[PDB]
Design an enzyme around this catalytic site. Structure first.
Site, PDB file in Angstrom:
ATOM      1  N   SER A 172       0.922  -1.109  -0.034  1.00  0.00           N
ATOM      2  CA  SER A 172       0.102  -0.048   0.104  1.00  0.00           C
ATOM      3  C   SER A 172       1.026   1.360   0.246  1.00  0.00           C
ATOM      4  O   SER A 172       2.064   1.403   0.650  1.00  0.00           O
ATOM      5  CB  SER A 172      -0.991   0.037   1.202  1.00  0.00           C
ATOM      6  OG  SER A 172      -1.680   1.109   1.316  1.00  0.00           O
ATOM      7  N   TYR A 196      -1.715  -1.277  11.498  1.00  0.00           N
ATOM      8  CA  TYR A 196      -1.991  -1.764   9.972  1.00  0.00           C
ATOM      9  C   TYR A 196      -0.815  -1.520   8.908  1.00  0.00           C
ATOM     10  O   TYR A 196      -0.302  -2.375   8.432  1.00  0.00           O
ATOM     11  CB  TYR A 196      -3.393  -1.283   9.497  1.00  0.00           C
ATOM     12  CG  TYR A 196      -3.173  -1.664   7.971  1.00  0.00           C
ATOM     13  CD1 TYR A 196      -3.269  -2.878   7.383  1.00  0.00           C
ATOM     14  CD2 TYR A 196      -3.365  -0.433   7.015  1.00  0.00           C
ATOM     15  CE1 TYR A 196      -3.291  -2.998   5.906  1.00  0.00           C
ATOM     16  CE2 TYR A 196      -3.496  -0.492   5.609  1.00  0.00           C
ATOM     17  CZ  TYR A 196      -3.427  -1.699   5.159  1.00  0.00           C
ATOM     18  OH  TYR A 196      -3.394  -1.931   3.893  1.00  0.00           O
ATOM     19  N   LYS A 214       2.299  -3.846   6.904  1.00  0.00           N
ATOM     20  CA  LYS A 214       2.498  -3.806   5.345  1.00  0.00           C
ATOM     21  C   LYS A 214       4.068  -3.531   5.201  1.00  0.00           C
ATOM     22  O   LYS A 214       4.827  -3.949   4.670  1.00  0.00           O
ATOM     23  CB  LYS A 214       1.750  -2.663   4.965  1.00  0.00           C
ATOM     24  CG  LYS A 214       0.343  -3.060   4.713  1.00  0.00           C
ATOM     25  CD  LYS A 214       0.219  -4.268   3.706  1.00  0.00           C
ATOM     26  CE  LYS A 214      -1.022  -4.835   3.433  1.00  0.00           C
ATOM     27  NZ  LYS A 214      -1.188  -6.033   2.633  1.00  0.00           N
TER      28      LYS A 214
HETATM   29  C1  LIG Z   1      -6.907   6.290   8.559  1.00  0.00           C
HETATM   30  C2  LIG Z   1      -7.353   5.432   7.476  1.00  0.00           C
HETATM   31  O1  LIG Z   1      -8.293   5.161   7.090  1.00  0.00           O
HETATM   32  N1  LIG Z   1      -6.302   5.165   6.076  1.00  0.00           N
HETATM   33  C3  LIG Z   1      -6.516   4.379   4.890  1.00  0.00           C
HETATM   34  C4  LIG Z   1      -7.221   5.410   4.050  1.00  0.00           C
HETATM   35  O2  LIG Z   1      -6.582   6.563   3.876  1.00  0.00           O
HETATM   36  P1  LIG Z   1      -6.751   7.579   2.666  1.00  0.00           P
HETATM   37  O3  LIG Z   1      -6.784   9.220   3.337  1.00  0.00           O
HETATM   38  O4  LIG Z   1      -5.730   7.632   1.622  1.00  0.00           O
HETATM   39  O5  LIG Z   1      -8.269   7.425   2.002  1.00  0.00           O
HETATM   40  P2  LIG Z   1      -9.608   7.870   2.615  1.00  0.00           P
HETATM   41  O6  LIG Z   1     -10.794   7.051   2.064  1.00  0.00           O
HETATM   42  O7  LIG Z   1      -9.751   7.808   4.243  1.00  0.00           O
HETATM   43  O8  LIG Z   1      -9.948   9.332   2.402  1.00  0.00           O
HETATM   44  C5  LIG Z   1      -8.991  10.082   1.334  1.00  0.00           C
HETATM   45  C6  LIG Z   1      -9.363  11.521   1.318  1.00  0.00           C
HETATM   46  O9  LIG Z   1     -10.778  11.849   1.576  1.00  0.00           O
HETATM   47  C7  LIG Z   1     -10.903  12.359   2.779  1.00  0.00           C
HETATM   48  N2  LIG Z   1     -12.144  11.877   3.302  1.00  0.00           N
HETATM   49  C8  LIG Z   1     -12.274  10.723   3.765  1.00  0.00           C
HETATM   50  C9  LIG Z   1     -13.790  10.223   4.220  1.00  0.00           C
HETATM   51  C10 LIG Z   1     -14.511  11.280   5.072  1.00  0.00           C
HETATM   52  O10 LIG Z   1     -15.529  10.841   5.429  1.00  0.00           O
HETATM   53  N3  LIG Z   1     -14.466  12.693   4.724  1.00  0.00           N
HETATM   54  C11 LIG Z   1     -13.262  13.250   3.997  1.00  0.00           C
HETATM   55  O11 LIG Z   1     -13.056  14.209   3.836  1.00  0.00           O
HETATM   56  C12 LIG Z   1      -9.634  12.209   3.521  1.00  0.00           C
HETATM   57  O12 LIG Z   1      -9.280  13.329   4.298  1.00  0.00           O
HETATM   58  C13 LIG Z   1      -8.711  12.109   2.300  1.00  0.00           C
HETATM   59  O13 LIG Z   1      -8.045  13.376   1.930  1.00  0.00           O
HETATM   60  O14 LIG Z   1      -7.395   5.003   2.444  1.00  0.00           O
HETATM   61  C14 LIG Z   1      -6.570   3.869   2.261  1.00  0.00           C
HETATM   62  C15 LIG Z   1      -7.294   2.937   1.223  1.00  0.00           C
HETATM   63  O15 LIG Z   1      -6.535   2.254   0.437  1.00  0.00           O
HETATM   64  C16 LIG Z   1      -5.674   2.803   3.173  1.00  0.00           C
HETATM   65  O16 LIG Z   1      -4.712   2.296   2.703  1.00  0.00           O
HETATM   66  C17 LIG Z   1      -5.519   3.979   4.230  1.00  0.00           C
HETATM   67  O17 LIG Z   1      -4.805   2.977   5.406  1.00  0.00           O
END
Ligand SMILES: CC(=O)N[C@H]1[C@@H](OP(=O)(O)OP(=O)(O)OC[C@H]2O[C@@H](n3ccc(=O)[nH]c3=O)[C@H](O)[C@@H]2O)O[C@H](CO)[C@@H](O)[C@@H]1O
Ligand SMILES: NC(=O)c1ccc[n+]([C@@H]2O[C@H](COP(=O)([O-])OP(=O)(O)OC[C@H]3O[C@@H](n4cnc5c(N)ncnc54)[C@H](O)[C@@H]3O)[C@@H](O)[C@H]2O)c1
Ligand SMILES: NC(=O)c1ccc[n+]([C@@H]2O[C@H](COP(=O)([O-])OP(=O)(O)OC[C@H]3O[C@@H](n4cnc5c(N)ncnc54)[C@H](O)[C@@H]3O)[C@@H](O)[C@H]2O)c1
Ligand SMILES: CC(=O)N[C@H]1[C@@H](OP(=O)(O)OP(=O)(O)OC[C@H]2O[C@@H](n3ccc(=O)[nH]c3=O)[C@H](O)[C@@H]2O)O[C@H](CO)[C@@H](O)[C@@H]1O
Lengths: 343, 335
Positions: free
Chosen positions: B127, B151, B155
């Protein structure tokens, strides 16, 4: 009654700690698969314990044996666990990494789970100053950046992180991580000591076998370092001092545990000593002469590493009391009295 | 040509199994079904069409060495694709030993069984989380690595284990694939899935009232977090390329790491706008502060993957939202 579970207690550092534990009035249960130690080390510790010898019970069990380990924990009330067990040869770890990842990680993960399931969440772990890698400055504080350069050192750094994550998830866990530096010597009686298999990899057990005539000369690994004499510089600590550090760790967990969660303490002397200085001290303590062969640097060797002892002195209320001269005296005593180990 | 796929009943694994079945491979899947339904591999066998008979499933945990040895002795595997493991970041902080046990001990046992059986060809599902908070973008495979939760530590530790294993045994051929952000589903709408896009979908249909935007003052073009979202079918194809690389140009492979991403960075609001167009529903927003541990902007450097792996993503943001909406509309309560 206060009972302590000691994994790997048959080994070098563990046996010396088990003896100190028995003398302090603790009951000791040892778990060891005897993969790199013999029963003789434990029997002689029981003998040195005098009247307290019967307070040592030995279980020949592998930490990865989950059912045998649950039987021990469910039939005992353990105040804390001191976790010495594991493989430690850097060379073997590079050539057989899965053996090292399996034994050290799966064994530790299994131990931590059995501990949490049986209400014992007080742990003292044998870490190492190897996690400081090749340090940019000395002395090394516990806040120095961490890294690993070989599979063995990787298992130590990962177990540390596992212990920190475990505490983060459960505040009932009280964990003290002890970063040993370079232990040398033996109990001053000369009755127990380090009994390495094959050709030893550490300096002082090699010089030891040269002094008793089993090996012809010591090979010095590199003389072009930026030290006083060009040889590597290390923090050499008496193994008896290392053992007392664990007593102080138990005292910390027993008297002042509300202010600790997963803490890390160096166990060193704060003094750096070169290879030639150690050879000079051993010649003085033993009256023998160590023939020298000069070779290049050993791949992965640090240049100069010694400990910042301030934190251990403050929080653990512990400081080493033995110097280089006493380390070589006690090593030679164990050496001359037992030139071929326990066998 | 037979391939062992661990965790093949899961999200990314099922899609990879389908792509493998279409390419003419026999696929043996090992999965304890602790986070996936067997209906996923049942539907995959349907979508495989005339190739569904090539899929073999065994409900087996990787820590069961005796069972795992028997499967390896029953087939002659060309390579192993290792998806199996737990991945909920929040479930890694509250239950870390469950993660260290399942992921590390499972992987150790699999690597040992592989070595003893003679199958030393591995594709491992890593990842982009190991890039932590990158100082520059795009993120190349040479970027410094660090983990920020249990997690992510499993990895990174597995990657180092594969590094050390190959270093000790040159017969090993290992490919590490760093995923980025998987989005979407197979375009049929028949298979699919804590993340942004699944959260956006629940707001679209009404299971949740609004989407909380975690941080609006980032140094990005609209102020929200930027990520590299890649279609799950593209991720599946990246593993087909990893097997192609192991089967063909293999003499100059040791333990190679390749990013699997699109190279494009998309913000939160841009994904909300993209999903509203593909779904017709509206996503009410609530703007909030930054979420702890969240990277500001992360996306892949794809130059290494396009050259040596001969792979490049085919799908864009619009198609990802379309397939995600398609799968979640037809199957609102999953399988
Ligand atoms: C803490 C966590 O969960 N980390 C995981 C997450 O991080 P990762 O941040 O990369 O991905 P997310 O799905 O959590 O969200 C991505 C972006 O959307 C924004 N966002 C997300 C949800 C929300 O309710 N509102 C919002 O604004 C986040 O701030 C971010 O900027 O995605 C990857 C999926 O492959 C995983 O490898 C990561 O381990
Ligand atoms: N020896 C050093 O110079 C030094 C310095 C820093 C850190 N350490 C660490 O301190 C600890 C003690 O070192 P040592 O010199 O006493 O080593 P040692 O090999 O003498 O003692 C370790 C003991 O653990 C046992 N053991 C190994 N795997 C086991 C398993 N799965 N189940 C049960 N028992 C098992 C071995 O049989 C051995 O008796 C080790 O964890 C080591 O990595 C060593
Ligand atoms: N990125 C990585 O990609 C991998 C898969 O991603 P995903 O989105 O498809 O998640 P996912 O949960 O859908 O896939 C994981 C699958 O592995 C299985 N699993 C867990 N532990 C197992 C074990 N010991 N033995 C066999 N199977 C086990 C789960 O049941 C699941 O089917 C993960 O490792 C993730 O971290
Ligand atoms: C790279 C390596 O193996 N490091 C391990 C070892 O190295 P570390 O170098 O700390 O300790 P050693 O006893 O192996 O070596 C001590 C010093 O003596 C020198 N020397 C050693 C042996 C010899 O035959 N000739 C010689 O000249 C070395 O260059 C070094 O400067 O220390 C600890 C063992 O307790 C472990 O935590 C370290 O992982």
């Amino acid at each position: 009654l206060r009972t302590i579970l000691v994994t790997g207690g048959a080994g070098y550092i563990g046996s010396h700690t088990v003896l100190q534990l028995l003398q302090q009035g603790f009951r000791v249960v040892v778990v060891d698969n005897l993969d790199n130690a013999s029963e003789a080390a434990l029997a002689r510790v029981a003998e040195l314990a005098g009247h307290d010898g019967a307070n040592l019970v030995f279980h020949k069990v592998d930490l990865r044996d989950r059912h045998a380990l649950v039987d021990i924990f469910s039939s005992h009330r353990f105040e804390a666990v001191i976790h010495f067990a594991g493989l430690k040869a850097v060379g073997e770890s590079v050539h057989k990494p899965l053996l090292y990842y399996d034994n050290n990680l799966v064994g530790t993960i299994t131990l931590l789970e059995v501990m949490a399931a049986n209400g014992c969440k007080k742990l003292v772990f044998s870490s190492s100053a190897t996690v400081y890698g090749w340090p940019k400055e000395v002395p090394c504080t516990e806040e120095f950046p961490l890294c690993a350069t070989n599979p063995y050192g990787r298992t130590k750094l990962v177990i540390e992180d596992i212990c920190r994550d475990v505490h983060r998830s459960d505040p009932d866990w009280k964990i003290i991580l002890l970063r040993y530096f370079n232990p040398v010597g033996a109990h001053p009686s000369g009755y127990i000591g380090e009994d390495p298999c094959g050709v030893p990899n550490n300096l002082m057990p090699y010089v030891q076998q040269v002094a008793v005539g089993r090996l012809p000369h010591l090979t010095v690994y590199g003389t072009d370092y930026s030290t006083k004499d060009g040889t590597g510089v290390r923090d050499y600590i008496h193994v008896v001092d290392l053992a007392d550090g664990h007593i102080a760790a138990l005292r910390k967990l027993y008297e002042d545990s509300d202010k600790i969660g997963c803490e890390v303490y160096n166990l060193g002397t704060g003094k750096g000593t070169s290879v030639l200085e150690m050879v000079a001290a051993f010649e003085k303590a033993s009256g023998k002469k160590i023939p020298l062969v000069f070779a290049g640097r050993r791949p992965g060797d640090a240049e100069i590493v010694y400990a910042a002892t301030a934190k251990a002195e403050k929080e653990l209320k512990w400081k080493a009391k033995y110097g280089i001269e006493e380390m070589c005296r006690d090593l030679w005593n164990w050496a001359s009295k037992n030139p071929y180990g326990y066998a």
